Amino acid sequence: MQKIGIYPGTFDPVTNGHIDIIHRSSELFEKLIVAVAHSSAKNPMFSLDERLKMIQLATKSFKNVECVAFEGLLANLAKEYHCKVLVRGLRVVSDFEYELQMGYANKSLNHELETLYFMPTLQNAFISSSIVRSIIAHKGDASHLVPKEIYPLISK
Amino acid sequence: MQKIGIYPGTFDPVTNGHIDIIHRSSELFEKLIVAVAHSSAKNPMFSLDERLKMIQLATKSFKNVECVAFEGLLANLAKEYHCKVLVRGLRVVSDFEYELQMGYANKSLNHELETLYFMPTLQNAFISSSIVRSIIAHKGDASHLVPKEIYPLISKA
Amino acid sequence: MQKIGIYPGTFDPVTNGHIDIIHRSSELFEKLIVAVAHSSAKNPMFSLDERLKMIQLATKSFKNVECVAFEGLLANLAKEYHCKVLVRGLRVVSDFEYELQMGYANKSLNHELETLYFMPTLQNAFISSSIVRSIIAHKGDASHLVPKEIYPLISK
Amino acid sequence: MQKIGIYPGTFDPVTNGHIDIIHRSSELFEKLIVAVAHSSAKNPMFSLDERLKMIQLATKSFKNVECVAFEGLLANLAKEYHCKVLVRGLRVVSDFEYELQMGYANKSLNHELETLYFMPTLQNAFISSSIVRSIIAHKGDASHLVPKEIYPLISK
Amino acid sequence: MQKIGIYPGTFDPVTNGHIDIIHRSSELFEKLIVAVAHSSAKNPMFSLDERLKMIQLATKSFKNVECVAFEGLLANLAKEYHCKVLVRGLRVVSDFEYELQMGYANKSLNHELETLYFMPTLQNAFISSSIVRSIIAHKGDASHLVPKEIYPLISK
Amino acid sequence: MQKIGIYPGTFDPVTNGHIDIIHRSSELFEKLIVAVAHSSAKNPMFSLDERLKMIQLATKSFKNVECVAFEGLLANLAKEYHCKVLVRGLRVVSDFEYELQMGYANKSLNHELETLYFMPTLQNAFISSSIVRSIIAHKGDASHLVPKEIYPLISK
Ligand SMILES: Nc1ncnc2c1ncn2[C@@H]1O[C@H](COP(=O)(O)OP(=O)(O)OP(=O)(O)O)[C@@H](O)[C@H]1O
Ligand SMILES: Nc1ncnc2c1ncn2[C@@H]1O[C@H](COP(=O)(O)OP(=O)(O)OP(=O)(O)O)[C@@H](O)[C@H]1O
Ligand SMILES: Nc1ncnc2c1ncn2[C@@H]1O[C@H](COP(=O)(O)OP(=O)(O)OP(=O)(O)O)[C@@H](O)[C@H]1O
Numbered sequence: 001m002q003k004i005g006i007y008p009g010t011f012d013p014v015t016n017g018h019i020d021i022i023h024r025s026s027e028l029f030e031k032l033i034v035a036v037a038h039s040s041a042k043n044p045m046f047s048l049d050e051r052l053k054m055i056q057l058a059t060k061s062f063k064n065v066e067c068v069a070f071e072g073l074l075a076n077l078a079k080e081y082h083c084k085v086l087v088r089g090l091r092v093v094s095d096f097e098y099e100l101q102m103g104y105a106n107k108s109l110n111h112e113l114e115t116l117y118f119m120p121t122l123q124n125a126f127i128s129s130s131i132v133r134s135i136i137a138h139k140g141d142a143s144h145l146v147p148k149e150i151y152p153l154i155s156k
Numbered sequence: 157m158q159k160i161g162i163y164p165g166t167f168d169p170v171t172n173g174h175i176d177i178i179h180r181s182s183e184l185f186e187k188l189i190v191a192v193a194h195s196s197a198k199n200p201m202f203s204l205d206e207r208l209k210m211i212q213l214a215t216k217s218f219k220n221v222e223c224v225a226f227e228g229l230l231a232n233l234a235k236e237y238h239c240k241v242l243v244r245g246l247r248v249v250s251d252f253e254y255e256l257q258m259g260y261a262n263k264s265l266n267h268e269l270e271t272l273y274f275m276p277t278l279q280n281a282f283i284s285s286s287i288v289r290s291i292i293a294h295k296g297d298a299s300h301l302v303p304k305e306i307y308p309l310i311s312k313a
Numbered sequence: 314m315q316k317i318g319i320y321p322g323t324f325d326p327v328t329n330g331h332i333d334i335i336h337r338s339s340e341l342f343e344k345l346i347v348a349v350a351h352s353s354a355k356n357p358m359f360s361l362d363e364r365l366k367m368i369q370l371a372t373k374s375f376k377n378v379e380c381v382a383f384e385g386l387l388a389n390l391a392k393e394y395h396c397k398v399l400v401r402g403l404r405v406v407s408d409f410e411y412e413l414q415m416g417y418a419n420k421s422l423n424h425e426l427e428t429l430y431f432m433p434t435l436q437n438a439f440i441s442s443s444i445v446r447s448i449i450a451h452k453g454d455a456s457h458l459v460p461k462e463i464y465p466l467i468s469k
Numbered sequence: 470m471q472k473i474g475i476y477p478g479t480f481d482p483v484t485n486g487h488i489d490i491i492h493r494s495s496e497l498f499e500k501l502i503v504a505v506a507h508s509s510a511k512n513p514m515f516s517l518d519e520r521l522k523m524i525q526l527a528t529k530s531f532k533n534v535e536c537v538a539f540e541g542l543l544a545n546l547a548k549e550y551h552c553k554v555l556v557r558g559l560r561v562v563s564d565f566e567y568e569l570q571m572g573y574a575n576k577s578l579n580h581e582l583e584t585l586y587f588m589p590t591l592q593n594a595f596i597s598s599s600i601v602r603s604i605i606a607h608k609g610d611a612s613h614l615v616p617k618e619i620y621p622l623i624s625k
Numbered sequence: 626m627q628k629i630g631i632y633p634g635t636f637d638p639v640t641n642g643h644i645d646i647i648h649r650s651s652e653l654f655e656k657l658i659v660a661v662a663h664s665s666a667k668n669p670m671f672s673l674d675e676r677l678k679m680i681q682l683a684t685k686s687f688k689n690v691e692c693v694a695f696e697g698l699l700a701n702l703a704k705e706y707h708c709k710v711l712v713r714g715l716r717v718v719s720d721f722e723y724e725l726q727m728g729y730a731n732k733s734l735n736h737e738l739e740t741l742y743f744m745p746t747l748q749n750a751f752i753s754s755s756i757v758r759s760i761i762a763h764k765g766d767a768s769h770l771v772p773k774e775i776y777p778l779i780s781k
Numbered sequence: 782m783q784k785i786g787i788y789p790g791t792f793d794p795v796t797n798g799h800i801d802i803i804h805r806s807s808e809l810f811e812k813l814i815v816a817v818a819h820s821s822a823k824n825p826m827f828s829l830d831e832r833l834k835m836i837q838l839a840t841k842s843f844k845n846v847e848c849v850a851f852e853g854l855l856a857n858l859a860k861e862y863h864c865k866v867l868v869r870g871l872r873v874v875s876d877f878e879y880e881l882q883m884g885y886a887n888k889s890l891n892h893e894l895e896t897l898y899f900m901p902t903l904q905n906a907f908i909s910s911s912i913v914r915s916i917i918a919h920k921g922d923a924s925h926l927v928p929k930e931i932y933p934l935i936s937k
Contacts, residue, residue, distance in 0.1 A: 001808040002783060024895055027782060028809065028866075073607045090898065092405055093253050096877040097562045097722070104595045104903050109609060114805060117871060117898035122439065122885050126260045134197065138229035140265055157340045158315065180427055183314050184341070241341075246430065248717055249566045252409040253878070260435050270337055273403060273430035278417050282570045282747065293510065294542040296578055385763035406878045410566070410718045417751050422765060439885045450821070451854040453890055470652040471627065493739055496626040497653065497710075559742065561873055565721040573747045583649060586715065586742035591729050595903065666918070698919040722874050726907045734921050 005116070007087040008035040008074055010129070012046055013136075013154060014055050017127040019147050020120035021089045026064050032087070034059055034067040035077060045133050050153065058147040075109035086115045092125055158184075161272075163243040164191040164230050166285065168200040169310060170211045173283040175303050176276030177245035182218050189237060190215060194227040201289050206309060214303040231265040242271040249284050314427070318342040320400040321387055323352040323442070326359055326467055327367050328459050330402065330440045333433035338400045339375045345400070347372060348383045348390055358446050363466060370462040387415075388422030396426075403430045405438055474498040474585075476556040477543050479508040479598070481515055482605075482623070483524045484615050486596040489589035490558040495531045502550055503528065503536045504543070514602050523619040544578035555584045561594050626739075630654040632712040633699050635754070636661050636676045637669035638779055639683050640771055642752045645745035646714040651687050658706060659684060663696035670758050675778065683772040700734035711740045717750050786810035786897075788868040789855055791820045791910065793827050794917075794935060795836045798908045800928050801901035802870040807843050813868070815840060815848045816858060826914045827934075835931040856891035867896045873906045 007025055011018060011034075026032050036052045038044075046054070048069050059065040070077050078086065086106060088099060103115035120127070127145055135142045136154055146154060163181060167174060167190075182188040192208050200207065208225045215221045226233050234242070242262060244255060259271035276283070283301050291298040292310060299307055318338055324331060324347075339345040349365050357364065365382055372378045383390050387399060399419060401412060416428035432438070440458055448455045449467060456464055474494055480487060480503075495501045505521050513520065521538045528534045539546050547555065555575060557568060572584035588594070596614055604611045605623055612620050630650055636643055636659075643659075651657040661676050669676070677694045684690045695702050703711065711731060713724060728740035744750065752770055760767045761779060768776055786806055792799060792815075807813040817833045819825075827835070829850060837848045851858050859867065867887060869880060884896035900906070908926050916923045917935060924932060 001805070028897075073603065073609055076607075090877075090881065092878065092881065093257050094877075095562075096871075096875070097873070100871065100873060100900060100906070101562050101595050101597065101600075103900050104906070105600050107903070108613075109604070115900060119881060119884050119896060119898075122436075122888070125438075125881075125885070126257045126435070128257065131257070131261050135229065135261075135265070137197075138227075140229045140231065144264070246409075246413065248410065248413060249564075249570050250409075252403075252407070253405065256403065256405060256432060256438070259432055260438070263435070271432065272341075273432075275413060275416050275428060275430075278420070278751070281413070281417070281751075282573050284570070287570055287574055291542075291574065291578070296542045296544065300577065386760070386765050388765075406876075406882050408718075414718055414751050414753065414756065418756050418760075421769070422760070439882045441882065444882065444886050448854070448886075448890070453854050453856070457889070493626075497741075559721075559725065561722070561725065563721070565715075565719075566717065569715065569717065569744060569750070572744055573750075576747070584744065588725060588728055588740065588742075591732070591907070594725070594729075595906075698916075698921045700921065726874050726909070726912060729907050730912050730916065733925065734916070 001084055003030045004033070004081065004083045005029040005085045005087045006033045006035050006078055006081060006083050008037060010039040010042060010044065011036050011051050011055050012044055012129050013051065013132065013146060013150060014058050015124070015127045015129055015132055015146050017089065017091065017120040017124040019058060020124050021087065021118050022059060022062060022065060024118050025087045026062050029064065032065050033081065034065055036067060036069050038069060038071050054150045054153060057149045073109060075106045075113060078113050079110055084112045084114060086113060088115055088117050090117045090119050093128055157241060158186055160187050160189065160237055160239045161185040161241045161243050162189040162191050162234060162237065162239050164193055164233070166195040166198065166200060167192050167207050167211050168195070168202050168285050169207060169288060169302060169306060170214050171283050171285055171288055171302055173245060173247055173276040173280040175214060176280050177243065177274045178215060178218065178221065181243045181274055182221055186220060188221050188243070189239070190221060190223045191233055192223065192225045193230070201293070210306040210309050213305040229265070230262060231269065234266050234269055240268045240270065242269060244271055244273050246273045246275050247284060248282050314397045315342060317344045317346065317394060317396045318398040318400045318429070319346040319348050319391055319394060319396050321348040321350055321383070321390065323350050323355060323357055324364050324368050325352065325355070325357040325442050326364060326445065326459060327371050327463055328440050328442055328445050330404065330433035330437040332371060332460050333437055334400065334402045334431045335372060335375060335378060337431050339378050342398070343377065345378045346394060346396070347378055347380045349380065351384045358449070367463045367466050370466070371460040373462070386422060387419050388426060391426050392423055399426060399428045401428055401430045403432050404441070406441060470553055471498050473500045473502065473550060473552045474554040474556050475502045475504050475547055475550065475552045477504045477506060479511060479513060480505050480520045480524050481513040481598050482520060482601065482615060482619060483527050484596050484598055484601050486558065486560060486589040486593040488527060488616050489593055490556065490587045491528060491531060491534060493587045494556045495534050498554070499533060501534050501556070502552065503534060504546060505536060505538050506543070507538070507540045519622065523622055526618045527616040542578065544575050544582060547582050548579055553581045553583060555582055557584055557586050559586045559588050562597065626709050627655060629656045629658065629706060629708045630710040630712045631658045631660050631703055631706060631708045633660045633662060635664040635667060635669055636680050637664070637671050637754055638676060638757060638771060639680045639775060640752050640754055640757055641749045642714055642716060642745045643680070644683060644772055645749055646712065646743050647684055647687060647690060649743050650712040651690050654710070655689060657690045657712070658708070659690060659692045660699070660702060661692065661694045662699070663694065665696070679775040679778050682774045682778070698734065700731050700738055703735055703738050709737045709739060711738060713740055713742050715742045715744050716753070718753055782865055783810055785812050785814070785862055785864045786866045786868045787814045787816050787859055787862065787864050789816040789818055791818055791823060791825065792832050792836050793820060793825055793910050794832065794913060794927060794931060795839050796905070796908050796910055796913050796927050798870060798872060798901035798905040800839060801905055802868065802899045803840055803843060803846060805899050806868040807846050810866070811845060813846045814862060815846060817848065817850045819852055826918070831934055831937065835934050838930040839928040841930070854890065856887045856894055859894050860891055865893045865895055867894060869896055869898050871898045871900050872909060874909050
């Protein structure tokens, strides 16, 4: 519990919300793994490596963090990791019941694996990766919405 | 505020619920711009151009309504028209928090951009575009759910 | 409909979120009636007299805003002023389906009467009267949550 | 009314949640029709004919249950079977107002057709087809999530 | 499961909802028991005996419906009636997760007792007893919201 | 940080869910303070003296858990214990947005104070103190929903 947390997502792209979660979650663990899924199902906008490199670039000055990709069931990724704690974010627009369902379905697959929920700062309470995508797609100013370390590649 | 409101949505297709919001909200501004967003992210059942035609036909009777299509960001649209107030509809099946969220995003992209929410008549309170789509795709009769002026166009696949 | 809108409430007490709704709504109507409800069943923390004085102090700066104490059904208040628009606040914690219900209930009693919903600003999105009352009850600092003019009165 | 109910679904695949609704609903009507929709717009993991086969196998022990495969409008299907009751399952992640919406719509398309809601057992309240699908696609144990009768045809 | 259903509630007062539901559910069981709970702890506006009288007057035309007033545990009342089905209405403002919670609580107190959910007609989907009470408290007109055979008893 | 977490509430009464959260949360902090709040304006079924005793009895086995009665601002308690983490539980029946609003309100009164959320086990996912109170008040058996150490006191 008090050792190795995993924070999974698509990180498409990473936002200031994701970064608050990584921050707070960071304080609480020894190693924290940022687990960038592939999420072929959800239509990805940025390539897994673009995404993984963006997080990598945003997560660098967090001395506890490591970022990585993966494909299969999150529950097993945690097994491989001798990880009993999933970190998830909660926000105004979260589908709360779906989150709870995922936490139990993860528990059901790996009887050792708990989920823990953190919230972003009030300023980031309404940021979703989805609105950020549209802002980027229609060419808006997303600069107060994502970490500056990624301005370069969001523009390419 | 009195001068210009914009009512933006996907309108896929426009529904009697939408028309209630347009009716009521038009009364409140000198001009109402109804703005049909391309919305590529969802895979709209109807084309951008079909949706614009549909809503033009449906809104002809409202003297101070103008329908455009935009593939811009809504903030630029607003700027273009010196518009400070967006209009949005609320219905029983709305995703209320997602609508609040859009409302704050729209403000922060355009600092004088506020959103105002209307509700349709009770008869149309359970109508969404999404349930009209399903009825239509399954060859059901949706003519009670949509203005009669678009019924020719919905009839084509 | 442009002539006159009514924003009813308990205003127990008036908060910065309520002031945002007054400000924006007063910009859209020739007059804005702020109607202060008895709210008997609620057993408010502050008396009617206190609540009405706080509304008047907070709203001095808005030249076209008037205050009135009232009792009971929104629909009849609205016919008394020949008003077709009720203004309502929407927030993260709003019970939205109940808002919709009230709006229909009110149009039933009075067929001309529409309900129109404003939001507060982001920094007030999480502010409720109720939370404000805990802070004052527990003798915390509520000064960043309520208008400055009210502040002397709100302190017991 | 009691002479006949229909329980429509994609059943992709049938899960222990579905079997609870079928069991309980079959207890209330003389006949229950379990109606497996092609649901071509979805992109079902299993073909219509496998889904149909699997739910037939899973329901043979319920003597008053009959399965059929259909394509188009359910409200019309129901008229063909002289059905006045559509059976729906509620579970923890249901979109509740959407369920009500669907009920009212189906009633506007067929004025005899009411919707009635059952719930699964507590154990199955958190079970979604979607989740069973992911697990199945990977190397996951779904044997506790779907009826034994079908767990063979799953990896076929 | 066919012979007898119970439809519990406070019925304070009975609305054109308690009634669409009585109508619909009474078509499914040989006998429908309408159980008026004393509900002491909600301080109902109308007394138990008044609510009972209202609901009897309003359900006289339904030949297989019987009304009873009670106050213990509803699960134990169900047992006394050899009842395996609790009937509940869902409406736009229902707290859905609370209804599911209740259905599971009762199931755990009486292992034969399931909960089944109906909806009222669309026109009544917004009707709430509390909205009827508030209209009444404030001398409004509630006559289009409650069945006509109770209108004498409520104007009083 | 990790040194100290606080789990506040009414605990009216402590339930199996609360206990699941204490279990899990106590494994992330050296010390966990269960902070018993005074239920102001909340219809408290059990006395403060009862609630504190039930939770001490029930948490005797967890060695790093201390239980205290607090009659002040929560954010302030946290300051007094030099605590930057509030532990909270998430359930199926939670008011999700209200919980978030509370997280944010506490941050604004104490800028160091973060909120972390746990789920209980699946079996307890639908349990709340509210449904336990109602079952106890109606004289039903709540022995499966509350820890065995507090049964004596409940019947007080
Ligand atoms: N603004 C935010 N603040 C805090 N947490 C967030 C925020 N947005 C998302 N999260 C959470 O962080 C985790 C990872 O989410 P992910 O990277 O998949 O993006 P997303 O925001 O869910 O969007 P999408 O699924 O559309 O890509 C989830 O637990 C999610 O709820
Ligand atoms: N675990 C469950 N328990 C009870 N009812 C369920 C469960 N899962 C689905 N249902 C309900 O049973 C019926 C059939 O649903 P359907 O077959 O369309 O699958 P689904 O679970 O909605 O998944 P998908 O759309 O991913 O294929 C619907 O009434 C549905 O809501
Ligand atoms: N508008 C409605 N339409 C259909 N069913 C309803 C409606 N309101 C309540 N019900 C159902 O009727 C039953 C009786 O509910 P009850 O008499 O407790 O009234 P209520 O509407 O919950 O009001 P209150 O709890 O404020 O007294 C409940 O089991 C509920 O499932």
